[PDB]
Amino acid sequence: GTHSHGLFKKLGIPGPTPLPFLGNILSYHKGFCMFDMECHKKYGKVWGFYDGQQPVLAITDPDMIKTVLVKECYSVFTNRRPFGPVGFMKSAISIAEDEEWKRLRSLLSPTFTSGKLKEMVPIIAQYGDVLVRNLRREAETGKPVTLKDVFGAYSMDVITSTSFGVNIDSLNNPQDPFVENTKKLLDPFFLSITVFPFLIPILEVLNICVFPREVTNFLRKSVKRMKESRHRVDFLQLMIDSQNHKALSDLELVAQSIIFIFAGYETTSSVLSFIMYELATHPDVQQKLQEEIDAVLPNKAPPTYDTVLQMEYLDMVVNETLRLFPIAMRLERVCKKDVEINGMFIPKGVVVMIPSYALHRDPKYWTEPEKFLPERFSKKNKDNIDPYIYTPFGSGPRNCIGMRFALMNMKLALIRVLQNFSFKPCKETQIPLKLSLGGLLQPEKPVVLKVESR
Amino acid sequence: GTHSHGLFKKLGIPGPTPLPFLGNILSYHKGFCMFDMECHKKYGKVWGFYDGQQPVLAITDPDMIKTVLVKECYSVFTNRRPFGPVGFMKSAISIAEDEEWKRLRSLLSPTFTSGKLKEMVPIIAQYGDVLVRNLRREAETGKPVTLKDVFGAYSMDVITSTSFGVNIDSLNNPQDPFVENTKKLLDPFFLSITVFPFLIPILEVLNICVFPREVTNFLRKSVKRMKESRHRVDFLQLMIDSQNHKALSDLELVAQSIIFIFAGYETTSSVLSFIMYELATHPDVQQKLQEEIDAVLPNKAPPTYDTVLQMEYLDMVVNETLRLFPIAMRLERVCKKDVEINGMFIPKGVVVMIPSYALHRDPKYWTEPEKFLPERFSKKNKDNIDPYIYTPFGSGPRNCIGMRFALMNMKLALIRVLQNFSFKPCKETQIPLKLSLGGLLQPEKPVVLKVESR
Ligand code: HEM
Ligand code: HEM
């Protein structure tokens, strides 16, 4: 009942009063983010609450954040909170724990170097052209456009060709066998889990594998097919070459490819939607970005790896968007052993949590946090931003391994789209933007905007 | 179903074919010991089987046994198999794991030194006299005696005064408040657990604490009472003094005292019964032991610590009994990480098992294993006994911490009993002795013998 609910009272840590069995989960009615900001505003730098019986400790002090994410990663704060009915996804790098995660991180780290990324941009760029070609049609109809569907088809085009070498236009090919199987995904089951964490083992024995055994065996056979028939430059080849610590197994290969698919579709499509909202509701910013793009890329020259990393205002626009909308919302680590960090006893089993969304909007570090102002990230003001307040990709050894790939993928899309189109709010546009009430950082209403052709 | 049942086939390890869900548990119909001997006789030095979905690897090679118990204890084979609905018993030394066990083992190790044991023998000896005084009555009735009840009352007399300083004659005081609460214990639930290990978490959330919340709070209040009112020489005082790593908590104190109670009652009473059976069915041995006792202890002098450790034939009789009847039956360790030991890959999560009972009766190391022959442990033949075949108290850092205390407690009882009585088989005596068909090493029928007075 209230088994471990006396933990934060005994340590003298403040926080909302938990209910028996439920803990503080009813306080999620306003959203993960609004709960984090309220607890921040009403308790200060550190507070605690309970996801059911699971005690969660929020910290907002930069030095303590650095200690948890960097200084004591391998020793105390190595793993994230487990775990829904896992299946074979236990071998996924973002799921793996302790030395198995360390093994996977080192086997996959060379795959995300700038050298391998630079070799992926000619393929990624090919679907930027496909993107504008499908945008040209939906724009000439002369009526608002749902960016979630055009960026979604784009994001899937990129991940299918970067993960396996499958080159298909998703929007105009409604059902390639690969496209549909990848679209087979995916509340309130997620809150049932945190309040019934003891029922997770039962889902394993019931053969209730979270992923459909059809799509799972489809990818596992698609990969082993691909393995057989096989100078390719996709994530699969980069992982097959690393098989010739201890090399990756074939099932471990499927697990990582599944992760990248999940990693790319939700994030990049949603962040591209947030950027286009901000660009459309701040026309002066949209114009300055297009003027910069036309400068480095004359007469709509194709963007390359080197020309992308040269665009400073583009990087300022991406970073300021990722401040207002950090899609991960939270950072989490489990405390492996009793530790004292920066004058504070953290007992074993506690989940330490960094409220990224709340920190990106705290008036202590940001002037007028609610306004979209790219000038915060100019070279002049970039220096006074604490890299442990602003953590859109986490930090430390377990930060986002695909950060460079995601920034490069989104910028290549933004450049090609802004070279050809302008974006204005229409009447269906939700202004101001409201965030979804659920447990994901996405717009409450799908972003709809006017698209004109240059 | 057969989720992990393909493990030993993939590694080329032999063993009985498992059934879906059940594994090899139906093969326990003859007993843990008969299953171990059959698998030993039918597979050689190493085999495997499944307790439900849990793979168990048996090993019988002495070098491999030394590597698992001693050489790689801290690194690979530190913990035992978990765990029924545990409750606060997670802080018990025999339940604790990894560094928490190491902490408890070092805090409790000084309590079991020979110095502290030597200070406990005047108290232990007091109830040896109480033992014969209750044996004198049940013998003068002139009819067979159930040793389980006289050794049981003796064993409880010893553990109550050694763990807390409570000095009561249990047999003639049917219900002292302490005696009854300790007697509140304790199939087929145990086999349900191994075939439904995923239902163990549900027993925790249902507040189904394995131990009655009445006796649990009784001891916890009995100890905290004892703590308050308090030159005493019991296990509690030795643990209270150690509170003045990090010192033991009050609830940790209750957890260890509960363990010693469980450790002493079942074992010592049952081993004393086995010894008296063997003494009664081998009168020549019983006479030679009494002749030795009368030599070192003239005219029935009281046994002391130094006079006990001087008796060689007594130690030979105890050791030969513990060979035929090793009450722990098995030794078990969980493999923490992938390891290679003595030319063999042991994957993570496997339970490595030493079949002590089967090794103590293997014709490879023992001539005529089924016969009770104390001469195997004479100084002449003691040298050629491998300390990893004969493991009545385990071995390595996690062996029986109370071995010296148990040997001293049983010998003090044997000496005082043999100074006064002789033991012959009666008609109710089960000859030959049969072992219980369940999952405990105890006689199938209670041992009943004739008792005469010297
Ligand atoms: C806008 C896009 C993205 C954002 C904002 C983002 C952000 C994040 C964040 C905040 C974390 C947690 C880091 C931590 O806990 O400290 C993370 C982890 C991770 N991300 Fe991303 N991510 C993005 C896209 C991607 C992509 C495209 C990939 C791969 C193709 C990827 C792969 C991963 C992996 C594997 C991890 C876990 C690494 C580990 O546990 O060792 N992410 N990401
Ligand atoms: C005839 C009597 C006894 C026998 C044959 C016996 C045998 C054993 C065996 C075989 C083990 C397992 C060792 C291993 O896994 O390697 C063990 C463990 C243990 N025994 Fe005993 N035992 C006896 C009595 C006692 C008594 C009287 C106590 C305490 C008062 C005790 C306390 C313990 C503890 C605490 C452990 C676990 C130690 C740890 O996990 O670190 N035992 N015993």
XYZ file of C-alpha atoms in Angstrom, chain B residues 58-388:
331
model
C 25.030 -29.549 -11.828
C 28.797 -29.990 -11.534
C 30.717 -32.743 -9.741
C 34.345 -32.047 -10.672
C 36.367 -30.961 -7.602
C 38.368 -28.286 -9.438
C 35.192 -26.769 -10.889
C 33.561 -26.899 -7.447
C 36.558 -25.064 -5.973
C 36.372 -22.425 -8.717
C 32.666 -21.757 -8.147
C 32.686 -21.736 -4.333
C 36.115 -20.164 -3.665
C 38.028 -18.760 -6.635
C 35.158 -16.868 -8.310
C 32.808 -16.239 -5.375
C 32.953 -12.437 -5.399
C 33.272 -12.149 -9.179
C 30.741 -14.635 -10.602
C 29.090 -16.944 -8.048
C 28.205 -14.674 -5.117
C 24.466 -15.139 -4.533
C 22.023 -18.009 -4.126
C 18.817 -18.641 -6.035
C 16.000 -16.173 -5.261
C 13.319 -15.873 -3.840
C 9.939 -16.640 -2.274
C 7.818 -13.761 -0.935
C 10.603 -12.194 1.091
C 9.354 -9.234 3.117
C 11.920 -7.672 5.431
C 13.895 -10.954 5.329
C 15.828 -9.356 2.464
C 18.268 -8.152 5.156
C 19.009 -11.722 6.297
C 22.614 -12.771 5.707
C 21.661 -15.994 3.919
C 19.207 -14.053 1.706
C 21.278 -10.930 1.115
C 23.170 -10.517 -2.144
C 26.413 -8.959 -3.429
C 27.705 -6.046 -1.287
C 24.843 -6.118 1.214
C 25.663 -9.751 1.969
C 29.363 -8.892 2.176
C 28.459 -6.136 4.639
C 26.393 -8.519 6.777
C 28.940 -11.349 6.623
C 31.687 -9.056 7.935
C 29.459 -7.593 10.661
C 28.441 -11.061 11.906
C 31.719 -12.949 11.351
C 33.342 -11.846 14.667
C 30.239 -13.152 16.470
C 31.077 -16.751 15.456
C 34.741 -16.827 16.494
C 36.052 -19.582 18.750
C 36.460 -16.995 21.507
C 32.768 -16.095 21.491
C 31.828 -19.770 21.114
C 33.959 -20.774 24.109
C 32.050 -18.197 26.179
C 28.742 -19.785 25.107
C 29.478 -23.379 26.196
C 28.636 -22.905 29.927
C 25.148 -21.805 28.869
C 24.769 -24.496 26.198
C 25.955 -27.130 28.678
C 23.257 -26.132 31.185
C 20.544 -27.471 28.869
C 22.433 -30.692 28.245
C 21.647 -31.458 31.880
C 18.044 -30.386 31.260
C 18.072 -32.732 28.258
C 19.046 -35.836 30.237
C 16.601 -34.873 33.002
C 13.742 -35.041 30.499
C 15.289 -38.150 28.934
C 15.481 -39.816 32.359
C 11.698 -39.502 32.675
C 10.816 -40.736 29.176
C 13.250 -43.641 29.673
C 11.955 -44.818 33.060
C 8.534 -45.251 31.448
C 10.168 -48.248 29.741
C 8.925 -47.799 26.174
C 10.267 -46.353 22.895
C 11.134 -42.661 22.659
C 10.724 -40.253 19.738
C 14.066 -38.441 19.577
C 12.598 -35.684 17.392
C 10.689 -34.350 20.409
C 13.518 -34.581 22.954
C 16.179 -33.156 20.633
C 13.683 -30.583 19.374
C 13.008 -29.269 22.874
C 16.759 -29.356 23.513
C 17.606 -27.513 20.289
C 15.077 -24.789 21.105
C 16.373 -24.456 24.676
C 19.824 -23.793 23.217
C 18.787 -21.312 20.540
C 16.561 -19.244 22.848
C 19.361 -18.747 25.389
C 22.117 -18.268 22.797
C 20.136 -15.790 20.677
C 18.402 -13.736 23.389
C 19.257 -14.913 26.916
C 15.786 -16.380 27.522
C 16.280 -19.411 29.784
C 13.282 -21.769 29.728
C 12.767 -25.540 29.793
C 10.638 -25.954 26.667
C 9.462 -29.539 27.209
C 8.014 -28.961 30.689
C 6.893 -25.374 29.962
C 4.418 -26.056 27.129
C 3.670 -22.372 26.553
C 6.015 -19.694 27.636
C 5.110 -16.671 25.454
C 8.530 -16.962 23.808
C 8.355 -20.745 23.330
C 5.021 -20.715 21.496
C 5.831 -17.784 19.195
C 9.039 -19.578 18.201
C 7.103 -22.809 17.589
C 4.816 -20.975 15.121
C 6.374 -22.625 12.053
C 6.045 -23.720 9.383
C 4.899 -28.011 0.529
C 3.166 -27.953 -2.083
C 3.370 -24.165 -2.294
C 7.138 -24.482 -2.766
C 6.783 -26.368 -6.059
C 4.029 -23.981 -7.154
C 6.571 -21.177 -6.715
C 9.258 -22.720 -8.926
C 6.676 -23.368 -11.670
C 5.021 -19.947 -11.146
C 8.012 -17.723 -10.278
C 6.241 -14.717 -11.830
C 3.564 -14.878 -9.100
C 6.100 -14.132 -6.348
C 5.810 -10.329 -6.827
C 2.032 -10.594 -6.421
C 2.454 -12.068 -2.934
C 4.393 -8.942 -1.938
C 1.734 -6.463 -3.078
C -1.020 -8.567 -1.485
C 0.694 -7.912 1.879
C 1.060 -11.741 2.000
C 4.129 -11.596 4.232
C 5.324 -15.154 4.593
C 5.799 -14.776 8.297
C 2.752 -14.112 10.466
C 2.609 -10.401 11.233
C 1.849 -11.430 14.834
C 5.019 -13.436 15.522
C 7.046 -10.992 13.408
C 5.937 -8.026 15.513
C 6.303 -10.186 18.636
C 10.011 -10.769 18.000
C 10.489 -7.178 16.831
C 8.914 -6.005 20.088
C 10.611 -8.732 22.141
C 13.973 -7.585 20.776
C 13.262 -3.880 21.278
C 12.110 -4.682 24.816
C 15.299 -6.703 25.377
C 17.148 -3.745 23.853
C 15.660 -1.380 26.454
C 15.977 -3.294 29.752
C 19.566 -4.134 28.775
C 27.804 -8.897 31.050
C 25.635 -10.983 28.711
C 26.947 -13.499 26.223
C 24.164 -14.179 23.710
C 23.994 -13.558 19.965
C 21.788 -10.499 20.533
C 24.315 -8.789 22.818
C 27.153 -9.639 20.432
C 25.107 -7.882 17.735
C 24.082 -4.942 19.937
C 27.730 -4.347 20.861
C 28.694 -4.327 17.170
C 26.287 -1.389 16.720
C 28.557 0.873 18.800
C 31.098 -0.574 6.886
C 28.010 0.825 8.603
C 26.559 -0.625 11.792
C 23.542 -2.923 11.813
C 20.048 -1.471 12.066
C 17.425 -2.644 14.545
C 15.326 -4.356 11.868
C 18.492 -5.944 10.484
C 19.029 -7.309 14.000
C 15.631 -9.035 13.984
C 16.324 -10.528 10.551
C 19.534 -12.266 11.645
C 18.047 -13.573 14.898
C 15.208 -15.115 12.879
C 17.811 -16.826 10.680
C 19.732 -18.374 13.581
C 16.446 -19.688 14.990
C 15.609 -21.374 11.682
C 19.233 -22.472 11.310
C 19.458 -24.247 14.659
C 16.101 -25.923 15.248
C 15.723 -27.939 12.037
C 19.380 -28.865 11.603
C 20.668 -29.825 15.048
C 17.557 -31.772 16.070
C 17.571 -33.711 12.794
C 21.311 -34.437 12.783
C 21.160 -35.562 16.413
C 18.403 -37.972 15.382
C 20.496 -39.362 12.520
C 23.485 -39.850 14.835
C 21.399 -41.701 17.421
C 19.965 -43.967 14.725
C 23.469 -44.841 13.523
C 24.700 -45.278 17.101
C 21.791 -47.589 17.934
C 22.150 -49.674 14.755
C 25.935 -49.968 15.299
C 26.356 -50.853 18.993
C 30.120 -51.362 18.663
C 30.468 -47.727 17.566
C 28.233 -46.523 20.405
C 30.377 -48.422 22.914
C 33.693 -47.116 21.567
C 32.358 -43.556 21.756
C 31.224 -44.030 25.358
C 34.599 -45.546 26.265
C 36.343 -42.509 24.773
C 34.015 -40.113 26.612
C 34.627 -41.824 29.959
C 38.383 -41.564 29.323
C 38.663 -37.795 28.833
C 35.729 -37.114 31.206
C 36.239 -39.347 34.269
C 33.218 -40.266 36.421
C 30.948 -38.292 34.070
C 32.745 -34.973 34.452
C 31.010 -31.996 32.785
C 32.133 -31.474 29.182
C 33.977 -28.240 28.466
C 35.061 -26.487 25.284
C 38.591 -27.893 25.457
C 37.512 -31.429 26.385
C 35.067 -31.523 23.458
C 37.674 -30.608 20.841
C 39.908 -33.361 22.266
C 37.505 -36.197 21.366
C 38.610 -37.693 18.051
C 36.171 -40.610 17.766
C 33.297 -38.242 18.577
C 34.365 -36.006 15.688
C 34.684 -39.084 13.472
C 31.128 -40.143 14.341
C 29.684 -36.683 13.648
C 31.499 -36.342 10.323
C 30.526 -39.806 9.077
C 26.896 -39.066 9.950
C 27.041 -35.738 8.111
C 28.352 -37.652 5.089
C 25.380 -40.023 4.918
C 22.957 -37.202 5.852
C 24.074 -33.741 4.656
C 20.964 -31.815 5.635
C 21.494 -29.039 3.086
C 21.559 -31.715 0.342
C 22.602 -29.140 -2.295
C 24.862 -26.118 -2.687
C 23.697 -23.378 -5.053
C 25.103 -20.215 -6.641
C 23.743 -17.941 -9.376
C 26.077 -17.062 -12.252
C 26.250 -13.261 -12.261
C 27.978 -12.861 -15.638
C 29.191 -14.877 -18.606
C 32.235 -16.801 -17.398
C 34.544 -19.602 -18.518
C 35.514 -21.949 -15.682
C 37.797 -24.951 -16.246
C 37.067 -25.196 -19.963
C 33.315 -24.591 -19.802
C 31.095 -21.651 -20.749
C 28.512 -20.817 -18.075
C 26.041 -18.216 -19.414
C 24.477 -15.544 -17.244
C 21.474 -16.399 -15.086
C 22.217 -20.123 -14.757
C 22.083 -21.725 -11.308
C 25.201 -23.805 -10.652
C 24.472 -26.638 -8.228
C 26.722 -28.915 -6.160
C 24.858 -32.207 -5.418
C 26.337 -32.755 -1.963
C 24.180 -35.774 -1.092
C 25.051 -37.538 -4.350
C 28.758 -36.756 -3.946
C 28.825 -38.073 -0.371
C 27.579 -41.448 -1.695
C 29.437 -41.713 -5.020
C 31.296 -45.059 -5.283
C 34.115 -43.188 -7.064
C 35.312 -41.500 -3.852
C 33.787 -43.681 -1.105
C 34.196 -47.413 -0.496
C 30.745 -48.931 0.140
C 29.002 -45.551 0.471
C 25.780 -46.833 2.047
C 27.457 -48.194 5.199
C 28.063 -46.096 8.314
C 31.834 -46.417 8.849
C 33.447 -43.776 11.096
C 36.958 -45.040 10.291
C 36.892 -43.025 7.045
C 37.637 -39.947 9.186
C 40.470 -41.285 11.333
C 43.716 -39.317 11.214
C 45.116 -42.023 8.922
C 42.392 -41.725 6.261
C 41.322 -38.106 6.887
C 44.008 -36.850 4.495
C 42.646 -38.559 1.360
C 39.169 -36.970 1.583
C 38.702 -34.182 -0.957
C 37.273 -31.097 0.830
C 35.193 -30.362 -2.286
